[PDB]
Amino acid sequence: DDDNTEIIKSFKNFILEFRLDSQFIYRDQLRNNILVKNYSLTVNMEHLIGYNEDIYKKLSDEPSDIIPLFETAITQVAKRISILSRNSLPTFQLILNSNANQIPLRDLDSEHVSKIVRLSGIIISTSVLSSRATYLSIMCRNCRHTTSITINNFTVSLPRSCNCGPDPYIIIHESSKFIDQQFLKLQEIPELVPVGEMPRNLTMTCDRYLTNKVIPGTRVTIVGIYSIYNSKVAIRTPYIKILGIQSDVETSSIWNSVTMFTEEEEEEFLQLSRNPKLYEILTNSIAPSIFGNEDIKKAIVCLLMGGSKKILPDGMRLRGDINVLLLGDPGTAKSQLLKFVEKVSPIAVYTSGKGSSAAGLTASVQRDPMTREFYLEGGAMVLADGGVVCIDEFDKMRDEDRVAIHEAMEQQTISIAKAGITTVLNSRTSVLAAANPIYGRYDDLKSPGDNIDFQTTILSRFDMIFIVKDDHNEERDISIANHVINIHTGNANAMQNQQEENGSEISIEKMKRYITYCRLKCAPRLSPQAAEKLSSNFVTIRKQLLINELESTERPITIRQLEAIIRITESLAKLELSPIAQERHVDEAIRLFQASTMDAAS
Amino acid sequence: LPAHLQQTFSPEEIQFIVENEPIKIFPRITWQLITTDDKALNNMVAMRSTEVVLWIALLLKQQSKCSIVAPQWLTTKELDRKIQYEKTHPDRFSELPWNWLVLARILFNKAKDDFHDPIHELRGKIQDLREIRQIKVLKGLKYLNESHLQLDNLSLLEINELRPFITEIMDKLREIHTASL
Amino acid sequence: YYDIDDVLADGTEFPCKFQYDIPGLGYNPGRPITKNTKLSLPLWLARILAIVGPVPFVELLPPDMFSTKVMNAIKTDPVALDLHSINSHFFSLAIKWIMLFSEKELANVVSELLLQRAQELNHHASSTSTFLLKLEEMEKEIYKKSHESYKDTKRWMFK
Amino acid sequence: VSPQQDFSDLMKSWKNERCSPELLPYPHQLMKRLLNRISMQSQLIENISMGFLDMQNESKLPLLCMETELERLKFVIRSYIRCRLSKIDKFSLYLRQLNEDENSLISLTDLLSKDEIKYHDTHSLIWLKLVNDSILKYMPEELQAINDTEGSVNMIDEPDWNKFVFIHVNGPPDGENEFGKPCYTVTIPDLKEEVELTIGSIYVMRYEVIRDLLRDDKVAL
Amino acid sequence: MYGDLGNKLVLEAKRTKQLYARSNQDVNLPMYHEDIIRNILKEVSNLRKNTEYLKEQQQLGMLDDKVAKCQYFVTLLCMERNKRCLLAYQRLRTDILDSMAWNNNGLDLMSSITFSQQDTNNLSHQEQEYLKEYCDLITDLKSGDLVDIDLSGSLVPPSDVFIDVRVLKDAGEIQTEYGVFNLIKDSQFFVRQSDVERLIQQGYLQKI
Ligand SMILES: Nc1ncnc2c1ncn2[C@@H]1O[C@H](COP(=O)(O)OP(=O)(O)NP(=O)(O)O)[C@@H](O)[C@H]1O
């Protein structure tokens, strides 16, 4: 251990001595974080390999036996930094990341066990916070000898030495110190390497300042260490202890959230607002794939920003942002489109169901068959809260909680009174309906309504409803057909978009950060007269659709339709980053739903 | 209208202040220059100790026709006596040349060659010195009250960099306090 | 005054009932309002309404933010309480009420509020997390001049 | 009269200037000899510079050293003056509030440079043009004045002698006001008692209580 | 409903203080709100319209009623209120612009405020006239010194003494002054601090 103490000196050396010209980065970082009460430091393994190779060669060999030692010195480092003596100072956390070298999950077996592995995968579900020991002490049940154990990481049962026997010790719970542990359940990336099979989930565990760092269902990178423990031959459960974890780009986001700030954003986000093309250049962000369909193309944008959400007392609150329908003949690009749309969302879930992929479209509470006691299992809508709703096959959605969609879209909630739990839980999720209409183009010579299940009311529940009609028509094709062979090889259209990147167009991983950005600032609002304009526009929309109904035609319009078009205003306005909205500003939102009014006229 | 800073001096500026202090050098050279605030000199003896202002020495060191002496205060074994005094005096800040942090960066940028083993040594000692001194500062900051302040020995860089925080705050203190009557 | 926050600080309504009947209602068709009708009023008008009547025009009940509730609430763990949630203009204000109404104790308390606050606020000198959200505007700006001082200082410190 | 004391007190004036609470007298008695002195060798240097073209059919070191000396010294007075011009604007009304009054010490030739008084009233005047043609039309009668009402307030501000600033104490001692224990000085604060002081000790407090000591040159800032 | 209308405006004044504060500094003031202040103005004229009317009414049937005495002590306050709001709005709106003057003209050879301060039309004409008149005034500070100053120039301390500046898509050369340094795209130099100060603010020069 004095060998380990020489290693201790080696790391104290490592910190005090190291230089990037000229400040000692970790050293600054310490006194920086001690007032953060971070009590942790993120160290490049490359500044380490650059400092002394030796210590890594032995670190990479049995890091488990060293990582705590590495901390016992830097926790001492704070002692020689934080304050001078001649409290209480918590035992440090360390989080180390490195560029390293990526390894795929399916190939992880034996071998590399008990070493470092950088890798990504994606988390499925977060385990509840579980607190674990840091310090504990004990008096003897018989001789009353006072023991003090420092419980360190990374099982180990309590030592019995002062009948006395066999092991007469019970924890002094009053004086003990503690830490949280996460128990990540995380899954391999969707792309590799499923081969034919199902995606694996390998279990890992956070602690301290690592906890709650990562959302359920977001792409992430963990480094950690591959290890095993029994957990009822020898057949012990595979797992990875976690150091250090870093979000895949960004992800940051959560919570409240982040910028941070990198000032060039405000300017670059304001210049966007000074670009008259910005609304439309967002439209040109959405489909490098899809040439044309500019209408619905303008329709996607306004959703993601979030629309008006105003909470006015009493508890009455109106939703945002809205709903959209991609229903139309196959060839619409709407699934390809949607597979753009979800990748655009900062946080969302792609549902072609039924519900996705295996998800109860609404959270279905299911008993833990072990230790009984129903617990809510989460849901696609639930996890997608404050994010996009993706729906295919909406012709086929679960009929019982189809209504929970009929509800959650509107009341921004789902009430579960089932079993024990009565909690009404938030889905503020904004739906985009991509289903294929009954019989394709055959509902066009028929009543276009009742197309969606057996009721027209679903349309009212939705907002921006759009029927995409592609006739086989000339030259609108020959140009997109021309667009095609370019799109494929050699991405002759995907190069042509990179000079529009330099000339005009957005990068769209940017578009995430844009829509994340302007959704966290307070809700935009129209001046009075555009609203009264919504009044004389709609009095004629409604007038028109009673007069249209002079033929006794069954149908379509509501008073949530006018309001629907309202939210589109604050959407398109939230583009502007402006607390107000101009008359014409609102007006192209009007022309934007105006096609849906003729969808009512067809 | 300066806008910035404005009351406090920019570190960028305060360096321009200290750059006006006297120091000794070891000339390579043997008109006048006339100048203004210089006085000296007649052709100045090469390879001998001589007193000049800093910035001139900076520039001629940039032509390497001079060599700047390490201040006799700046040495390893010396920093030890001072930092030790610092640990055994939890309240007082001990004693310093006062333009020093600036002097440190200034010399290390160029004058680096003239010292014997400043490298990987003093920058650490002064990082730590500035450290324990910084905690002595920050810990002294709980006595902050109107209207009295003893910062005693504290460097102009040290002070100015934190100037807005005590100044601006203390006004919010005194104002309200006497305002009570 | 010519700092936006000065006209902005009087933009706060205080509970006040008038000691007199006031024909020519300041707000709609009283036209007078009977004596002791409770009303929230901006300080810019109210401030003098005590100074002139020797009985004043207005009674001026204690504000909701100075309640024993809040006054000891801050006394418990000053760092944690969110000042942005309360007004947010407080030190920019409480100073005004402590002038106008001329109290002596709450001062000695409040000063300590700002003190502890600053004890923490300095600790952010080094280059948030939840904290940055919850600061008062002057408590937000002290951060500007303080921090930016350092933010320049380090950038000088190296190249 | 020492050319070095000129710049010593030039920095004294400058350093005191930006840190200062409010505008203080314009040191023309010494600056004058300066603003001439600058042009003296500003002209001289070019004679020996173009005179260096006379050897052209070696030592440029003191050449550009001397050149440098100028811009380095010329920049000095810039922040000094500009800061004053700002504080003038900031105080433009109060300057007139002291100006129209008889007592005690006024702008005159005494506080402001000639360019400073010119800039002062030309600025406040054109300010009046801009404020009058735009928001005073539109100018109800009691509102016709831009000044004290009274309350609140306005500018007035900022004769704040109360403000806090960092200082460093010095004087060419009798060893006057020196009471010990090692060193001077008093005097006691408005609402409190004496501290007191030593030159080696930097003591931060109200600008009022210490102001005389700036006037006395008994303390650096 | 009363003196509130100005509070929207001073709030906007807060945000526009923030647009210069960090900021980062591009200045570009949003606009003079001509409409809203005039709403205020129709009520500020309305207020003294009511008050002048009451000044008639106090003389007849009110008979210096202790309450009739109030509204002069009352409505006039909102007059001061508006005044405060408008004043400080404009003192902001001007201090920012005077700052926008000092920094750049701008600098040689300013040689004009034309196209400088891109707001142009957007900045209200009373302020346009004012501002350009004010830098007309600052030109007289270029008259007073006789330094030479270069108050607009030489903001930051010198060092040392020679730097390498690179030109960005700039020609050039305007270099008739002193000597002709032949500005070309992608052209850098090694030169003293002196000549830098003008084309570094003129945008032509870059690297320090
Ligand atoms: N701009 C485009 N417009 C139309 N088709 C396109 C476009 N770009 C690519 N395509 C191709 O045509 C298809 C567009 O999708 P589409 O045929 O409408 O199926 P879908 O309707 O999106 N899936 P579904 O929701 O089940 O009906 C893709 O498979 C592409 O190969």
Ordered by start, the domain boundaries in chain C are 1-159
Question: E104 — phi, psi (to 5°)?
Answer: -115, 100
Give the H/E segment covering residue A390. strand A388-391
**Residue in chain E nearest A265 by alpha carbon:** E24
* Shared-domain flag, residues D95 and D146: yes
CATH class of the domain at C1-159: mainly alpha
Residue A512: which residues within 8 A CB-CB, separation 6 or more? A344, A345, A346
As a whole number of angstroms, the distance between CA A516 and CA A346 comes to 7
In contact, D105 and D111? CB cutoff 8 Å? yes
Chain breaks in chain A (C to N over 2.5 A) after: 86, 154, 162, 232, 555
For residue D173, CA distances in Å to A571, D12, D39, E138 come to 74, 18, 36, 45
Q: Do A267 and E26 touch (CB under 8 A)?
A: yes
- B165/C122 CB distance under 8 A: yes
Please state, in angstroms and rounded to a whole number, the distance separating the CA atoms of residues C58 and C67: 20
By CB atoms closer than 10 A (0-12, 13-18, 19+), residue A473 is: exposed
Distance from CA of C43 to the nearest CA of A (A): 26
Please give the helix or strand (H or E) that residue B162 lies within, else none: helix B156-179
Q: Choose one of A329, A335, A336, A392 to mutate for the ligand 1 pocket test, by most ligand atoms within 8 angstroms of C-beta.
A: A336
Given the CA of residue A435, which atom of ligand 1 is nearest to it?
Answer: 25
Of ligand 1's atoms, which has the minimum distance to the CA of residue A335?
22
Cβ(A587)–Cβ(A491) under 8 Å?
Answer: no
Nearest residue on chain E to C28, judged by CA atoms? E1
Q: Is D149 near chain C, with CB under 8 Å? A: no
Q: Is A574 annotated as a binding residue?
A: no
With a 6 Å cutoff on the Cβ, whether A331 touches ligand 1 is yes
Q: Whose CA is nearest to atom 21 of ligand 1?
A: A330
Q: Is the CB of A340 under 6 A from ligand 1?
A: no
A352 in contact with ligand 1, CB cutoff 6 A: no
- On whether the CB atoms of residues A574 and A306 are closer than 8 A, the answer is yes
B100-109 helix and B11-18 helix, angle to the nearest 10 degrees: 90
Strands A413-415 and A237-241, sheet pairing:
unpaired
Which residue from C minimizes the CA distance to A37?
C123
Upstream peptide bond of A255 is cis (omega within 30 degrees of 0) = yes
Residue B136 DSSP class: H
HEC string of A304-354 equals: HCCCCCCCCCCCCCCCCCCEEECCECCCCCHHHHHHHHHHHCCCEEEECCC
What's at C152, amino acid-wise?
A: D
Instruction: Output Rg (C-alpha) for chain D, integer angstroms.
Output: 23
Cα(D208)–Cα(D162) distance, integer angstroms:
6
Query: Ligand 1 in contact with A199 (CB < 6 A)?
Result: no
Q: Tally the C-alpha atoms within 13 A of residue A248's C-alpha that lie toward its C-beta.
A: 18
Which residue has a Cα nearest atom 26 of ligand 1? A335
| Residue D64: domain span | 1-157
CA distance B5 to B9: 7
* Pairwise CA distance, residues E27 & E131, whole Å: 15
Looking from the CA of A14 toward its CB, the CA atoms found within 13 Å total 25
Top mutation candidate among A294, A335, A341, A390 for ligand 1, by most atoms within 8 Å of CB: A335
Q: Are residues D2 and D70 in the same domain?
A: yes
Shortest Cα–Cα distance, A22 to chain C (Å)? 7
Nearest CA owner, ligand 1 atom 17: A331
State whether D149 and D167 are in the same domain: no
Q: Distance, CA A333 to ligand 1 centroid (Å)?
A: 3
Task: Give me the CATH number covering residue D128.
Answer: 1.20.58.1030
Q: Which residue is closest to E18 within chain A, CA to CA?
A: A266
CB A307, CB A323: distance < 8 Å: no
Tokens of A181: 């542990």
Region for A226 from its dihedrals, namely left if φ exceeds 0, alpha if ψ lies in -120 to 50, beta otherwise: beta
> Hey, where are the domains in chain E?
1-154, 155-208
Residue A489's Cβ-count burial label (10 Å; 0-12, 13-18, 19+) is: exposed
Binding site annotation covers A335?
yes
Enumerate residues 6+ apart whose C-beta is below 8 A from A53: none
CB contact under 8 A, B168 and C149: no
Cross-chain residue pair E88–C4, CB shorter than 8 Å: yes
- Tokens for A506? 């957005």
Contacts of residue C4, defined as CB under 8 A and 6 or more positions apart, other chains included, come to E10, E13, E14, E17, E88, E92
Q: How many angstroms separate the alpha carbon of residue A399 from the centre of ligand 1?
A: 27
Q: Which residue of E has its CA nearest to B16?
A: E157
Output the CA–CA distances (angstroms, integers) from residue A324 to A175, A409, C104, E176, in the order listed.
58, 11, 62, 65
D85 and D55 belong to one structural domain: yes
Domain tally, chain D: 2
Contact B120 A19 (CB under 8 A): yes
Which atom of ligand 1 lies nearest, measured to the CA of A289?
8
Q: How far apart are CA D55 and CA D58, in angstroms?
A: 10
Q: Could you tell me if the CB of A498 is within 6 A of ligand 1?
A: no
- Which residues, in sequence order, are CB contacts of A591 under 8 Å at separation 6+? none
| Residues of D with Cβ-Cβ distance to C2 under 8 angstroms | 154-155
CATH of the domain at A280: 3.40.50.300
Q: Is A330 annotated as a binding residue?
A: yes
- C-beta of A334 in contact with ligand 1 (< 6 A): yes
Structural domain range at position A429? 263-601
The annotation status of A207 as a binding-site residue, yes or no, is: no
Contact A31 C126 (CB under 8 A): yes
Are residues A152 and A66 in contact, defined by beta-carbon separation less than 8 angstroms?
Answer: no
- Rounded to the nearest angstrom, the minimum Cα separation between B99 and chain D is 14
**CA-to-CA distance for E201 and E208, rounded, in angstroms?**
12
Q: Please give the structure tokens belonging to residue D52.
A: 């260096």
In whole angstroms, give the CA distance from residue D203 to residue B15. Answer: 23
Residue D155's closest chain C neighbor by CA? C1
Ligand 1 pocket test, pick from A296, A332, A356 with the greatest ligand atom count within 8 Å of Cβ, gives A332
C-alpha span between A408 and A382 (Å, rounded)? 10
Report how far residue E104's alpha carbon sits from residue E102's, in angstroms, rounded to the nearest whole number: 6
Q: Establish whether A460 is an annotated binding residue.
A: no
Give resolution, Å, one decimal: 4.9
Q: How far is E157 from chain D (nearest CA, A)?
A: 7
Residues of chain D contacting residue B32, judged by C-beta atoms under 8 Å apart: 62
* A440 C-beta closer than 6 A to ligand 1: no
- How many angstroms separate the Cα of C47 from the Cα of each of C36, C57, C96, C97, C138? 17, 11, 9, 9, 22
Q: Is A332 annotated as a binding residue?
A: yes
E87 contacts on C by Cβ (under 8 Å): 2
In B, residues 127-146, which contact A (CB 8 Å cutoff)? Answer: 127-128, 131-132, 134-136, 139
Task: Report whether residue A574 contacts ligand 1, using a CB cutoff of 6 Å.
Answer: no
- The atom of ligand 1 lying closest to the CA of A470 is 4
Cα(A31)–Cα(B136) distance, integer angstroms? 13
Query: Of D135, D157, D179, which marks where a domain is finished?
Result: D157
User: In what helix (H) or strand (E) does residue C42 lie, and over which residues does it extend?
Assistant: strand C38-42
Do D112 and D145 lie in one domain? The reply is yes
Type and span of the H or E element at A237:
strand A237-241
D-chain CB neighbours of B13 within 8 Å are 79
Token pair recorded at residue A441: 């183009």
C21 contacts on E by Cβ (under 8 Å): 67
Residue C1: list chain D partners with CB under 8 A. 152-155, 157
